[PDB]
Structures are given as C-alpha cells and as structure tokens.
Design a protein around this nucleic acid. Structure first.
Ligand SMILES: [Mg+2]
Ligand SMILES: [Mg+2]
Ligand SMILES: [Zn+2]
Ligand SMILES: [Zn+2]
Lengths: 163, 50, 79, 149, 87, 50, 352, 228, 249, 19, 230
RNA sequence: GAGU
C-alpha cells in the first residue's frame, strides 16, 4: 500500500548483482531481459570489444542492453528497491523503468499497489483459465500458489537445512 | 522490502529503545544519523523478516 | 492532445503535474473566462489546456508569474 | 449416413458451399460450412440488463447510494476497483467516488450545482459513513477522537 | 472539519458521560398509537433531538423563528433533525 | 440468417454444432426437394416414392 | 419528453468528455480504462476489440460498468493517466498488452502466407498499390510468389528518416500489408508469414522506434485489415477439416495386443500389479504420442499436391491447422482430441 | 418512392494524385452498392494509355542484362509500366528514346510526338553508369482499358512477333488505387444513413475528380435502357 | 420445431403437461381458440355420461419469469383423434414436439470482427419475420392503504394531471383494457392524505401570489415503469368486505 | 498521498512542518 | 471509350411470383458490376403495399381471443402481414371484410375496391369454427417501402389512435428473393461479352419488368450526384 | 441465476 516513489535519487551506492539465470543449462531468463530498464549501480570496466563503461545511475535502454550482449557481460550490479536508502518510500533510480510507460518511473507513483496487483492477478486468473478449460490429462496453479504463499508469509519449512 | 520493514534492537541506543523493542528500520537509521552527529550511545539492532 | 497525450507529457514531464497544470488552466477558462491562446476549433477547455501545454505556452511557473503580476497590480491599485 | 442424406439433397459431401459477399458480389476465397443450426434466444435480454444513474435515493445509515437496477442503484466501486485507481494514480477521480459521488452530503449537492453552472469544481468533505464508524466505536466504549490541526 | 490525526484510547466512565446528552432509562421505543418517541426511551427526542427539522415534539415551537429554543411543555430542543444521528 | 465465428470451434471442442449444421442442411435440402415437388404438383405416387 | 434539441445538446456535451469502463473482477489497473464515448442508438455498450485482452472480455454475454469523471481534474486524470491509448504496456512485464487476437491474427496470417505458384507466380510489380490493384482485379492470389519494388524507410542517427528502394521477393499479400506498415520500420518484418507471435514483436518494434502515436494508429490499421482479410478468406470449419491419420486402427490394435501381453504376464503372478499398471500406462502414453505425430505429419504437410514442373510438397492450408499455426485459436493439443486419439484420462483422485 | 439523393460534400485533394471524397447522406445499404460498383468501373474500366510493347536494340530478352546499365531489363520494363503518357489524337504511338552518357535517363529524354504528352518528365527509366554506354529503344504505347497482362496477350496472340520485341503488361487504367470506406451519417431522425468516403490514387493526365465523373457516367449509360 | 432433434422432444413436451393431451380418443366436436370439445368413441365412452370431453385452453397468462404462457389448438374441427394425442400445444411445443427455439441458416466464417469473441452477426430478415420476437407479461399493482391520516383513495382526481394522461383512465381512475402505454403513463390513479408541512417563505409568497392553495391530497399513482411499454390486457380489482366498490370493479 | 495527490499532499506537509 | 449498352432480352415469367430475366450483351465485368448493385437495391429500396392497421369489432387488443375463431388475434394479424395486395390508384385504402358461417376465410372474401387487386385470393386469414360466428373487420393497406414495424411507428407516433385499432408491422418490400447468374454472350468478334440472368421471386403483383425499371432508376438517380455535382 |  504505502510504498510510493518519494525521491529522485537516494544517493546510494547499493544494489543486487544479477546473473543470467542458467538454472540447469538453458538460459531461462537472459541477463538482458532480467535487467532491462534498471539503473546500473556501479560500472564494470572490462576493456572488451565495444569499450563499455556505462556509468553509474544509468537506466538500461535497449541500446545499452544490446551493447552488453556484444560484450558478453557476465553479471551486473543493479540498483534495487530493497537496497534503497530512501526512508518512507523508494527513489525513481532504485526502481527504474515504469514498465507500463517504457521510460523512467515518475516520482509520486504508487508502486506498491501496482506490484501487488501485478503479482496477484495472473494467479487469480490462471485459477480460472486452466480450470473452466482444464480438462484432459497428458499440478497447474492449485499446487503452485500454496508454495508462493508459504514464501511471502515467511513460513519456516518442515525439515530445514542447517547453516 | 515490505517484509523487511521492522528490526529488533539488541542493545540500548541514546534514546529509549533498549533491548528487544522492535522498531521500523527507517526510524532507527534516521536516529543513527543523529547519533553520528551527536555521538552518544549508538543503537545496535538487527533487521527481522516478517 | 485529444487522443494521445505523449508529447504533452514530454513537455512537462511528470504526468501527475501535467494533470494539475492543465486542470488549473482549464479552471481559469471555465470560471474566470480567461482567453485561450490556441484556436479552440470547437474544443473543450481541457483539450485547449493540453494543446497549449504541448506547444509550450502554459507552464506551472508561468502560471505563477501571471498570478503574481496581476495580483500585485491589484494591490497597487488598492493603494 | 449424413453425407448420404446430403447426396439425397444434391448437397455437397463437405457440407461447405460457395458463398458470395452481399456487399461486393464477389465470392469468398474458399467454401464455407453452411447449414441449419437450431438456436435459442436466452432470457438475458439487454432490455433488462441496461442501467444508468446520475443521482437518486441514498441509503439510510451509510448514506451511500443504494444497489440494484430495480432500486435505481449505483454500481459498487469496490476495493478491487479502488486499487485500480491507486495504481493509475488518479487521485481526484478516486476521491470523487469516495465523497461527492457517495456519502459526502454537502459535497454532492454542491458539486451538482457547480456542474449545472459549468464549473466542474470539486468541493469535497467527509464521508458520512466514516462519522458513523466513529459513533459505532464509541458505542462500543472505545474513545476514538479526532485531534484536529 | 479537517483534522490532522486520530487517536484511540480507553473510554473512561466519565468520558462516556461527556458524549451523552441523556440517560436512557426505559426500553420504550415509541408510542404504539402516536408513533412518537417515548419519554426517556431508546429513541427519546428529549435526549437525541427532534424528529422533524426545527420542530419540537408537541409542536409548540416551529421553524427558524424559534432557533435554539427548548420547549417547556415537552422538553425538546428545536434544531436540525440531523442531530439524531449524532447525539 | 446468422454468421457465426468459426474460431470458437477447435478450442472449444463442441463439434456437435458442426455435425448439427451439416445434418441441418441435409434436413433442409430434403425439405426443399419436397417443397419443389409440391409446388410443381407431380402426384401422390411420385412424392411417396421419394 | 426527450426533445430533439436535447439530443443536439447531449451530443455537444459528450464531445471530448472521457468515460471510464470497468470489468469485473478488476485484477489489475487496466481493468478500468478511459475512452471517448461515441453515442449509439441501441442498448449495449460497444467495446474496442484490442483492449479485450486487458479486460479479459469475451462477448458471451459479458457486461461492463461505466463511470463519469465529473471534475476538470478527474476528466484530466482520465484522459492523461487512464486513456486506453496511453496505457498499452503491462505494468507487470514490459510487454504490449494490446495485441491482435483471433480473427485479426488469422487474417494477417492469411495474407502473408505463401502458396505454390497460384495466380501469377513470378510477376513483377511497381509498388504495393499495383499489387492491391492486381489482387482486387482478380489477376493474382494473395499467396502468389512475386517480385516487388518496395521503398523502406530506415530511421537515421537523428530524427531524420533515410529511405531505400529495393526489389524484394514477397507475396502480393505482404506487399499490401506494407501499406499499413509505417515508414520507419523495415520490410523484412512483414516479409515473413505473420502470426500472433510475430505481430506482438511488430508492435513492440514500432513502439520503440516510432513512439506512441504511430503505434496506436498502426494497431487500429492492423485490426481493420486483419478482420477484413479474415472475412474475404472464407475460412470455415467442416468435418472434413479434422483429418484422422490412416494408421490409427493398426497402431491401436498393436497397443492392445501389447497390453494383453502384460495382463497375461500378470495372471502368471510374475509381474506385480504396480509394475503392470505402470507399463500399461507407458504403452498408452507412447501410443498416444505416436498417433498424434501421425496426425500432425499427415495434416501439417498434406499439401503434397503441387505444381509448376511436377509434384511438390508444401504447408497445409487446412482450416484448423491454419488457426493453430497462426496462433489465432486452437493448438496441437486441442487438435489431438479432435482428429487424433483423445488419450488417457485422470480420475478425480488424480490417479490415471 | 421518396428518393433520397446524396450530395457531394468534401473533396480533400491531398495531392493531385491522391484525393479523398466524402459523400453524404446515403440511404442505408447504398454506401456499399454505389461504393463497390464505382470501384469496379474505376479500376478495370477507366480507359487510358499504357506501354504495350518494347524494343531495345542489343536486347534479345527481358532476363538479360545490358552493359553500362545499372538496371536489368526487367527493372526497366517495370518503370515503363509506371510511365504516364497522354496520347491526344491517335490510339497507338511508338515513341523513340536514344540517350547516352553518365545520366539517370528520365521521361524527358524521350522524343515527344506532336500529340503525345509525357505527364511526369522526371520519371526514372534507366540509369546509365558507363559514359560510353548509349541506350536506344522504341516503346509502343497503346490506348486500352483495365489491366491486360502480357500473359493474356501471348495466349490469344497467335500473331507471331519478331524476337527482340518485348511485350509488356498493360496497365491501361489511369486509376492506380481505389478504396471506399462507409461510416454512419447522422440526421435528427435518420441515424441509419451512411457516408461514403472514396480514396482515389491516380496517375498523370486523368484527374481524380474527373475520373469519378466519368465512371458515374459509364454506369448511367448502362442504366439508360432500363430507365426507359 | 427443431430440424436436428433427438427424439426426447416429444416425450418432454407431453410429459411436462404444458400441452393439452386427449384423455379419450374420438372425433373433435368443436375446436376453438379458447377450448376444445371432443366426442368420445363408443368403445372407450362410458355408458353413464354423455361422453363428450371438454378442455378449456389457458390463454395468454403470466409466467414466473414474466414470459407468456398461451395454449394453441393443434387439431382441426371434425378430426378423429387417438387417446394420448396432443390436442393443443403449450408455449414452446409444436405438434407434440418440444420447440425451444428456432432453426436457421448459419454460415461459419469471420466477418469484419462483428463476430469477434462469440459475437453474433444476424440478418435483419430474422427480425422482420419476428420469429425471435417474444412476449412478456408483466404485473403492476396499485395498493390503497389506510393510514394514520386517513385512507388513500383510488380516484382519477389527482393534483396536476394532464387531460392527455386522464384520457386513458376511466371514471374510477383505472386504465382501460386495450390501452397502449409507455413509461410515465398513469395506470391506476391513487392519492394520499398529506399532513402538515412547514411551507418555506418562498412558497408562502408564491401561494399568496397565485392563490392556488395546495390541496390536502398528494399523488401516489401507479405508473408505467420507465422505458417499458406495452398494452394493458387485463385488470383485476380487490376490495375489502365492506368498502364501497369502484365503478370499474 | 500519491499520484496526482502527491503535489497537494506535499503542500499540506510543508504547512505541517512550518507550524 | 468503347461504350456498349445492354438491351432487355427475355422475360421468362415462369410464375407470377418467380421470373427469370436474361439480359445481353454486357461488356466484360459489367455482368457482376450491375448484377450486384441491382440486387442490393432490389432487396431494400423496392416499394410496395402492406397492411398497416387493423380494426376488428369486438376486439380491444391483439392478445385477446375471439369466440368461434380458431386463430387468436395475433395469428390473424400474422396472416395479414402476408396478404398480397396491389393498389392501382391511391396510396392508401381501407378494405372491409364481413364473413360468417363455418368457413376458412380467404382473401376472396374481402370486398375488393375498384382499384384494389387481391393477388392471392386463396390466402388464408382466419378459420371460423362456429357457424353462428361472424367476423367483421377493416384492414388499412398503405403503400411504403422496406420494413416499418409497429414499434417504429408507436415511438414516433405521438398521434393517438382510438383503442380498438390495431397497428401492424408493415412489410412493404415485395422482393422475396433475388439472384443473378453471369454466362458468356457470344458475338462474331466479341466472345468476351457476358449475359446477365436475373432470377427474381417476389410476392404478388410487382411486375418483374417494372421492378427492374424502377431499381435501375433509383441507381441512376444516385449517379446524378456524382456526375452533375462533379 | 450472469462473466470471469
Ligand atoms: Mg471467450
Ligand atoms: Mg465471458
Ligand atoms: Zn535508492
Ligand atoms: Zn414542545
């Protein structure tokens, strides 16, 4: 509810290092798709082919993303909502692109509500889709959402790993 | 991020926080900016997941 | 302006502030009967305001300027 | 058996026929399946479903408009529907639905007169249902007071 | 009308008496015949206010000509009926 | 008389409607042949044979 | 009394005034969108096809709610923040939520797809206008392979557009769609046989290069031409369209003799009930896959019936296969149940 | 009969070549009645002129390539289909073109006959790269109507021509493109009326508006027998 | 009837009981819209009575869903009829078979998006032939209650009513049978006794200007619900045991 | 306190901060 | 311009209702040009006559039932929609019908006005069961075109009629079905010419040839606008 | 009972 874009720039250096999801082998979600429209927290100078620094606090336009692919960037620190220093909300930089607009998010936008709706809706809809329809057998969502709910509710598992 | 809103303080600050109170991380970091300025007893805390 | 508001948003920047700016202008035309810059071409106040902003005639700061100019001259008239 | 019946009619085995576009006179590019389907008109006439309301009666305690077309009701703008406007950031439209369009008694009448006078001004106040909430809480024996400015 | 904040605290016996504009000592709602509120009852108009705008119960004081007047005969204040939801 | 969208068949797997349409047309075709024969007024015998 | 001057007045007021349409359940923000109303005589609301996605609206009797933004501020909020033209992309993933569906896809697929020679193979055409003219004169099919001179605009480093004329190898159909295509985009995007999946990328490309206004016009255009050609095609569904592969009964009798083998091995008391259950199920799953492959080979490329020198092989223009291949409607899964084997059903227990 | 006639409303001639024409009010169904009938006439029936045959020296067939010329012979032929020519007097003329040197050859370079007007002189025909390259050709322009392709002609044309002479698809019809859109038109009482919007794209000489007038005239000529 | 049926059609129609079926076979003595008189065969005909069966058919009646229930005869005058044959068809039956809808000529094809997601494009022909056209019989009631102030009256004498309005109402204040109505028209005139009301000074001034002192009685007349319109086909009056009856009653 | 309302709400907030 | 006009050739009136009309020679492509355009017009624009109003004595409304009559009043009204009438002179006539006795009442039983021809005299209207039953009505037939339903009329018709008088959906349009076939016409030189064969099925009266003349006239009127005004 |  409460989460809103309060600030332009929190002035933080913080952020999470995203790798390309190579769960198993196949590039499940390419780096580019996972990272597009995010602010780069920190450059990475690898001398390379296209001479890319890409400076701090740059929103990844499709341009800069294409350059990443040519250069074969391994993993990248990207500014994130969680690592924002803004108290009572987040900054436009740590969020990045308003995906619905195709550019940097405007301060004032109620991001939280958008987030919750976006995450919730597919579950709620797919619970109607492959069930009015879901007929023959060759699971689905009824198994998945309990897993998701157990995550967001931070329930400790029945037999946990030790660290 | 919304899940990580709160933090349990383990050790007294210059305020009336003291052991075991759980306060919003925003408010205790803003307090720490003022502690940095004024010195005094710093507040040792630990962020909690909810 | 009527269909797409993209260029108008590109002039001001913040969508929400664009709303506020055009509404304050449209309120002037609605109530004060303040004269439009762009030819109406049979269009409503709100549309006029959005065109004006698109072409870069109206601005929050420019509205504040005309406010003080005229109010100050009214005070001068009083005294 | 069905195709044999079509041959007795001198109709095609495909049950598809050459059809012509009534507007142009030219034929459609390929054969179209044509025949008689037995169809029904269901009880859901648009006549019964169409409904519209500007202003009308309001509810007894909550003061918000009544529901249902037979009682000349307004639609419910529910929690789900509110969230939509939050997402968009449409603040005034939201407030409008919460106040001048629903409980806010002074607001609705003032807004109506403003609308008839052209000036689409918002003159909002406090939803009567909120007032009632407080009263309900105080009847519970919890002191809930507004500390003003 | 516009406030900044809202507080909840325990309702003291004394605080509850402050809100009250009358002690209800009877279960009587209204009269069976003249469907008008019964004395010291749950709907007492002497306590919660007039049923009709700027009219006392027995009808002695009528209209704005008598603004804040409290009828000696019936004991009802002559004000907006609005108050029956408030008091 | 009516134009229905064929895009609502494969996904739906209600093929009864298609067979119904084919048989429907054949039903009508026989009807038209009887109707043609009645308009001409061939005779009882011919109608009965068909 | 509903006097005739009142209708003129009503018409006056509603011009430029946005109204909000909502459909339940309102799961994301696009479940409420703003539109300019067009007054119509008749009691139902008419909704634009391309935003049916966001509403999840299908017209099997669906209903929607209408709301009037009253104030200058609310009207502005509606036109600026909530207008359908302004809100294209899903706020969840960065993807255009307005995408052609169903008949539109089908039509575009129909025009772009190629057939062997057909009417006027290897013609040479001056511009796509000559193509349109030839098609509608009835001297060329939409699927006729042809050489055509197209002028395609590539946008420069700055805002200025650099065009380039080129003779390409495409169908009459593709040339005609190029007229809907804005200058700025390349010809190779439309030069392929178009489906739902290619058209989403089309729209995306247009948004990123040209911007909002162009894409909105382009989307409407695509819708008009899509439906238009969908109808012209004459595309329909007969029982002949569902092709059963010739080798069903053989495959099945074999699978039945196989299952009989494991049942006899069970009566001997060697193989357990669970082992037999699993082997029977594997037999039938594999049989199912095999029959389906047969169905799709026999359907997908059943147009083994071509020309010009002698016999040649090509993609099938069977109606269901077209619907499924375009992504307009159906899929191979559905078609399995229609023409193939239905397959193994699962009990309410979950067990098969 | 309460005959409801349309009146020609707007003629937005966006370009001399391209023109939109709105038209209202039309009684219901007549939007498409008239729309399509006219479109047919406009395309296949509008009489005009077009290159029917070509002969370039040192060119045996259309698939060959000429030295010192960028465009292959087919490319040249395509440009000739597009060539806008008005012949005033005769119905058949044979124009000559001899041009040399490092030049984009245009329509102006054709020797214009007394009664033969080249509408678009800047129309590109061929590009001469080598300066020592000289191209020489004779282009037969006939008057006809509609679209007569070379494949139609070769079938019926048992009359043998000489090798060398290249037949071309004749696009006689000066109407390059035509389409009509039908929107609803509003009257106080009648909201079932419709408006016809005809978008025409035509080439040289023949004017959009004038071609419309003539198309209607052809249709009306046919109707004369049945009005009587 | 449905061209492509199953056979259960006949059974449903007959067993539902909505159709009139023949108890005893014999020859039809008198057919009518309203009834059917059939004279029974000697072999089935009991030796006691005359042996002529009479079936009155239920005409245009209101259903629970406000549909129209009418029974039509499906026999000719002087026809020999077997026992358990259908004499008269119910509301959605045709010669004994179930007839829920209507078959028609359909083509499966896209058409300019006018059949987008199951949307249906239908020919004007179907409307002209009125085959899908339906009847709905709705029921409007006007109650005259006795209040604390005095009784409500059902008079046509109502403050502020046009002669146009009162044309279709009789002396009693009840609309005539047959009368075509549209929303806003008064069906049954009714008036209620108003108590005292503090008339705003404006109305004091205005009623002093015009004289026109407002009468003791208000206006509670039952009118046509808005934008529904039809023909009054029947009226029914209920009076108590002792109240002076209306002229219309 | 978000979207269109952020402007007005921060104006109110500065009124709260200056008394 | 190689202008070439067709001439009306054969009018094979197979039946008063059904008529074939061959038409030749038409230049190439004009077969369909003209064929479709005429078909559109023929279906809609074609003017005709139809029962607009009805008044039966002892009948307040259409939902009631009359005694001694098999058919309910609506059933009668349906039959009247179907009733084929040609009015020669006037555009509005009111025919009377008083019939009694045990008889299937047909169109013949209507008293024909001097200039009013009943095309299908055998057309069933009502079945009188009781011999003592006598039915008496007055049917108003007007001339119009297309389809004007009673619901259209009641909406615009604030002009109040007397109770008793029953308005009917007017199906004015006479053309029941129409189709055109295009075959090749052969001239000595021109074998690319075409013949148009128009098969028409109309209700009573409206003469095949006459309907063709009128339909062509409507189309030509429209063409005036595109020729004369530019 | 209507569309999810
Ligand atoms: Mg659907
Ligand atoms: Mg639905
Ligand atoms: Zn930040
Ligand atoms: Zn008193």
């Amino acid at each position: 509810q409460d989460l809103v874009v309060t600030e332009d720039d929190c002035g933080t250096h913080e952020g999470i290092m995203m790798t390309p999801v190579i769960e198993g082998g196949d590039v499940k979600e390419p780096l580019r798709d996972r990272v597009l429209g995010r602010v780069t927290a920190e450059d990475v100078l690898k001398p390379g082919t296209a001479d890319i620094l890409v400076p701090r606090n740059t929103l990844l336009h499709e341009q800069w993303c294409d350059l990443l692919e040519e250069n074969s960037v391994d993993a990248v620190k990207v500014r994130s909502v969680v690592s924002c220093d803004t108290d009572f909300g987040v900054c436009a930089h740590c969020y990045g692109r308003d995906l619905a607009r195709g550019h940097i998010i405007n301060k004032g936008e109620a991001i939280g509500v958008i987030a919750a709706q976006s995450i919730g809706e597919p579950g709620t809809q797919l619970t109607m889709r492959t069930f009015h329809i879901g007929g023959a057998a060759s699971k689905d969502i009824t198994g998945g959402l309990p897993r998701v709910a157990d995550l967001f509710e931070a329930r400790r598992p029945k037999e946990p790993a030790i660290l | 991020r919304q899940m990580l809103r709160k933090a349990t303080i383990v050790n007294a600050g210059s305020s009336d926080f003291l052991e075991g109170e759980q306060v919003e991380y925003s408010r205790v970091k803003i307090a720490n900016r003022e502690l940095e300025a004024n010195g005094k007893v710093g507040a040792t805390y630990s962020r909690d997941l909810l | 302006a009527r269909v797409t508001v993209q260029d108008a948003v590109e002039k001001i920047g913040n969508r929400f502030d664009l709303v506020l700016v055009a509404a304050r202008r449209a309120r002037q035309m609605q109530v004060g009967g303040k004269d439009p810059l762009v030819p109406e071409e049979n269009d409503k106040t709100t549309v006029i305001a959005l065109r004006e902003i698109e072409e870069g005639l109206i601005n929050n700061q420019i509205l504040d300027v005309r406010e003080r100019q005229e109010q100050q001259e009214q005070e001068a008239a009083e005294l | 058996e069905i195709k044999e019946l079509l041959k007795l009619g001198d109709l095609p085995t495909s049950g598809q026929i050459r059809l012509y576009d009534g507007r142009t006179g030219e034929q459609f590019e390929r054969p179209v399946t044509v025949g008689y389907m037995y169809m029904l008109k269901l009880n859901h006439l648009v006549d019964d479903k169409m409904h519209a309301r500007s202003t009308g009666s309001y509810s007894l305690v909550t003061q918000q408009p009544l529901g249902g077309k037979a009682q000349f009701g307004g639609q419910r703008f529910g929690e789900m529907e509110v969230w939509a406007l939050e997402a968009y950031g449409a603040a005034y439209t939201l407030q409008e639905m919460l106040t001048v369009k629903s409980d806010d008694v002074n607001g609705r009448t003032k807004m109506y007169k403003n609308i008839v006078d052209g000036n689409h001004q918002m003159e909002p106040g406090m939803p009567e249902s909120f007032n009632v909430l407080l009263k309900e809480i105080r009847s519970l024996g919890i002191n809930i007071e507004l500390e003003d400015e | 009308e516009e406030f900044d904040a809202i507080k909840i605290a325990l309702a003291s016996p004394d605080m509850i008496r402050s809100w009250s504009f009358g002690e209800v000592k009877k279960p009587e709602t209204i009269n069976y015949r003249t469907f008008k509120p019964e004395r010291d009852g749950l709907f007492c108009a002497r306590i919660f206010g007039p049923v009709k705008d700027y009219e006392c119960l027995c009808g002695k004081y009528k209209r704005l000509k008598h603004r804040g007047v409290i009828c000696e005969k019936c004991g009802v204040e002559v004000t907006q009926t609005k108050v029956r939801r408030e008091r | 008389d009516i134009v229905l969208n064929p895009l609502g068949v494969p996904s739906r797997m209600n093929i009864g409607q298609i067979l119904e349409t084919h048989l429907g047309m054949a039903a009508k075709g026989i009807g038209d042949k009887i109707n043609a024969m009645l308009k001409q007024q061939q005779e009882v015998a011919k109608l009965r044979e068909f | 009394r509903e006097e005739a001057v009142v209708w003129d007045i009503l018409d006056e007021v509603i011009r430029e005034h946005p109204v909000l349409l909502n459909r339940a359940p309102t799961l994301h923000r696009l479940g409420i969108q703003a539109f300019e109303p067009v007054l119509i005589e008749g009691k139902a609301i008419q909704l634009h096809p391309l935003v049916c996605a966001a509403y999840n609206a299908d017209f099997d009797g669906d209903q929607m709610a209408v709301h009037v933004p009253l104030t200058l501020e609310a009207q502005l909020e509606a036109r600026a923040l909530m207008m359908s033209t302004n809100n294209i992309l899903s706020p969840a993933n960065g993807e255009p939520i307005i995408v052609p569906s169903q008949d539109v896809v089908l039509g575009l697929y129909y025009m772009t797809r190629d057939c062997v020679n057909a009417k006027g193979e290897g013609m040479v055409l001056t511009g796509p206008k000559e193509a349109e003219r030839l098609y509608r004169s009835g001297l060329a099919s939409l699927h006729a392979r042809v050489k055509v001179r197209i002028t395609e605009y590539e946008k420069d480093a700055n805002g200025e557009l650099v065009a380039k004329t080129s003779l390409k190898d495409t169908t009459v159909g593709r040339a005609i769609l190029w007229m809907i295509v804005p200058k700025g985009l390349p010809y190779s995007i439309v030069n392929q046989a178009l489906g739902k999946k290619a058209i989403s990328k089309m729209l995306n490309t247009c948004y990123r290069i040209l911007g909002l206004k162009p894409t909105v016009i382009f989307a409407d255009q695509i819708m008009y031409t899509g439906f238009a050609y969908a109808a012209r095609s004459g595309a329909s569904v007969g029982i002949d369209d569902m092709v059963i592969p010739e080798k069903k009964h053989e495959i099945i009798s074999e699978a039945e003799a196989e299952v009989a083998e494991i049942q006899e091995q069970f009566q001997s008391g060697l193989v357990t009930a669970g082992e037999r259950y699993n082997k029977v199920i594997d037999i039938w799953a594999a049989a199912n896959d095999r029959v389906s492959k047969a169905m799709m080979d026999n359907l997908q490329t059943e147009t083994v019936i071509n020309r010009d020198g002698q016999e040649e092989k090509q993609v099938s223009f069977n109606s269901i296969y077209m619907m499924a291949d375009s992504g307009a409607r159906g899929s191979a899964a559905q078609i399995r149940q229609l023409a193939g084997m239905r397959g193994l059903m699962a009990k309410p227990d979950g067990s098969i | 009969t309460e005959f409801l006639k349309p009146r020609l409303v707007d003629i937005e001639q966006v370009s001399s070549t391209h023109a939109k024409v709105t038209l209202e009010p039309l009684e219901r169904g007549f939007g498409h009645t008239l729309g399509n009938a006219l479109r047919r006439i406009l395309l296949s029936s509008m009489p005009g002129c077009a290159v029917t045959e070509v002969e370039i020296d040192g060119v045996l067939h259309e698939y060959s390539t000429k030295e010192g010329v960028q465009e292959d012979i087919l490319e040249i032929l395509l440009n000739l289909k597009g060539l806008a020519v008005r012949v005033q007097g005769k119905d058949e003329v044979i124009l000559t073109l001899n041009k040399s040197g490092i030049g984009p050859v245009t329509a102006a370079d054709i020797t214009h006959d007394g009664d033969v007007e080249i509408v678009k002189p800047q129309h590109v025909i061929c590009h001469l790269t080598d300066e020592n390259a000289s191209i020489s050709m004779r282009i037969k322009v006939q008057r006809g109507r509609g679209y007569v392709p070379a494949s139609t002609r070769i079938h019926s044309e048992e009359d043998e021509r000489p090798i060398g002479r290249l037949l071309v698809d004749a696009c006689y019809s000066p109407v390059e493109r035509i389409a009509y859109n039908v929107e609803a038109a509003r009257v106080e009482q009648r909201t079932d009326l419709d408006k016809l919007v005809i978008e025409m794209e035509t080439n040289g000489t023949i004017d959009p508006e004038e071609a419309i007038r003539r198309a209607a005239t052809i249709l009306a000529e046919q109707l004369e027998a049945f009005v009587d | 009837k449905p061209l492509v049926g199953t056979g259960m059609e006949r059974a449903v129609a007959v067993d539902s009981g909505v159709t009139a079926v023949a108890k005893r076979g014999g020859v039809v003595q008198y057919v009518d819209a309203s009834r059917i008189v059939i004279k029974v065969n000697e072999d089935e005909m009991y030796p006691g009575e005359a042996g002529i069966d009479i079936y009155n058919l239920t005409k245009y009646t209101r259903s629970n869903q406000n549909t129209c229930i009418n029974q039509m005869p499906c026999v000719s005058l002087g026809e020999p009829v077997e026992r358990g044959d259908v004499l008269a068809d119910g509301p959605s039956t045709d010669l004994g078979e179930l007839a829920l809808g209507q078959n028609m000529r359909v083509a499966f094809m896209p058409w300019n998006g006018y059949n987008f997601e199951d949307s249906i494009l239908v020919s004007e022909r179907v409307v002209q032939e009125d085959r899908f056209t339906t009847i709905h019989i709705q029921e409007l009631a006007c109650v005259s209650r006795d209040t604390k102030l005095g009784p409500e009256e059902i008079t046509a004498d109502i403050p502020n009513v046009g002669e146009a309005a009162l044309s279709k109402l009789d002396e009693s204040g009840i609309v005539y049978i047959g009368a075509e109505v549209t929303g806003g028209d008064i069906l049954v005139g009714k008036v209620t006794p108003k108590g005292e009301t503090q008339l705003t000074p404006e109305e004091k001034l205005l009623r002093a200007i015009f004289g026109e002192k407002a009468s003791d009685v208000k206006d509670s007349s039952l009118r046509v619900p808005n934008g529904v319109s039809g023909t009054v086909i029947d009226v029914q009056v209920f009076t108590r045991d002792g109240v002076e009856k209306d002229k219309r009653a | 306190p978000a979207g269109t309302g952020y402007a007005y709400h921060q104006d109110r907030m500065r009124r709260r901060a200056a008394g």
